[PDB]
């Protein structure tokens, strides 16, 4: 019921996250921003180019093992 997601930043660095299919993705967003040392609202998180909301889940978005989330400046 868990999958690994690769979060890729503008500098091509990666942080991977193991998440549940049903978990709201706010916690991933907050954790990634924390590790970059920037406010969460300074970033936007995309899956297949579409914005990931705080209450989106991997299941809702159709995500699969080793799928990529891209992070851009807001």
């Amino acid at each position: 019921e868990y999958i690994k997601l690769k979060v890729i930043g503008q500098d091509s660095s990666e942080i991977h996250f193991k998440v549940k299919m049903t978990t709201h993705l706010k916690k991933l967003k907050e954790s990634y921003a924390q590790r970059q040392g920037v406010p969460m609202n300074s970033l936007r998180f995309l899956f297949e180019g579409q914005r990931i909301a705080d209450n989106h889940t991997p299941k809702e978005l159709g995500m699969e093992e080793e799928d990529v989330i891209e992070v851009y400046q807001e």
Binding site: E14, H16, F17, K18, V19, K20, T23, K27, L28, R35
Partner: peptide
């Protein structure tokens, strides 16, 4: 300059 693997569990 190769980053190590980073996996965080939530």
């Amino acid at each position: 300059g190769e980053a190590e693997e980073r996996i965080i569990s939530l």
